[PDB]
Each structure stands twice: as structure tokens, then as C-alpha cells.
Design a protein around this ligand. Structure first.
Ligand SMILES: COc1ccc(C2=N[C@@H](c3ccc(Cl)cc3)[C@@H](c3ccc(Cl)cc3)N2C(=O)N2CCNC(=O)C2)c(OC(C)C)c1
Length: 96
């Protein structure tokens, strides 16, 4: 089966975060250094919640400036409604 052959070694698609992003996931309670992209998103959400980087009024708004997360994103702020910067950062900080 060629479809089986193609997908072998590639059915979970784990990533190894680059060291600064790994430190963020660890601060949100992650362990080890291999994750699914779904796990990375869970831990990043948790990180923002535990470091209180969101705005209690406009909870879609993240103020990451002066946090390690802001350094990785190259931003002072972002909205979960317009998550382009997060896509960019994860493309650069997740290794297959
Ligand atoms: C209107 O209020 C909302 C609405 C949605 C999100 C959100 N939306 C989820 C989400 C957003 C963008 C992408 Cl690309 C993926 C997932 C996910 C998330 C995951 C990673 C990051 Cl870096 C930020 C947010 N994410 C969350 O982490 N949420 C889910 C909703 N409530 C929560 O308890 C936490 C949200 O996130 C806060 C952490 C800012 C707040």
C-alpha cells in the first residue's frame, strides 16, 4: 500500500521546539522536548493564562511585549482573532 508507505513515520508529526519556545512550554507545565503541534498550542494558551498576558476586558488581546513570548513573536501585542504572528513564530520555532 503506497499510502501506508508514504504516511509511515509521519502519522503523529511531533515537533521539537527551539530552546526559547521550549522554556515557554515548560513554564506552562510541559515536560520533555517532543510534542504534537496540538500540545504546543495547549501549552502556549496555558502560558498566557498563567502569566496573565491577556486583557481581562478584551480577553482575545495578548500583551506579550517585554515577555519572552513577545520577543519570539517580535510583537508587543496580538489578537487571537488575527493570529498571523503566531503562525509565523511556530513555522520558525518548531523543528520536524
Ligand atoms: C476571546 O477570548 C479568547 C478566545 C480564544 C482564545 C484562544 N484561542 C486559541 C487559539 C488561538 C489562535 C490559534 Cl492560531 C490557535 C489557538 C487559544 C490560544 C492558543 C495559543 C495562543 Cl498563543 C493563544 C491562544 N486560546 C486559549 O488559550 N483560550 C481558549 C479560550 N479560553 C481559554 O481559557 C484559553 C483565547 O486565548 C487566550 C489565551 C488569549 C482567548
Amino acid at each position: 500500500d503506497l499510502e501506508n508507505l508514504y504516511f509511515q513515520g509521519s502519522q503523529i508529526n511531533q515537533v521539537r521546539p527551539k530552546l526559547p519556545l521550549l522554556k515557554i512550554l515548560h513554564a506552562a507545565g510541559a515536560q520533555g522536548e517532543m510534542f504534537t503541534v496540538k500540545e504546543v498550542m495547549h501549552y502556549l494558551g496555558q502560558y498566557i493564562m498563567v502569566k496573565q498576558l491577556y486583557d481581562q476586558q478584551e480577553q482575545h488581546m495578548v500583551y506579550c511585549g517585554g515577555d519572552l513570548l513577545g520577543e519570539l513573536l517580535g510583537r508587543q501585542s496580538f489578537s487571537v482573532k488575527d493570529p498571523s504572528p503566531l503562525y509565523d513564530m511556530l513555522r520558525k520555532n518548531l523543528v520536524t
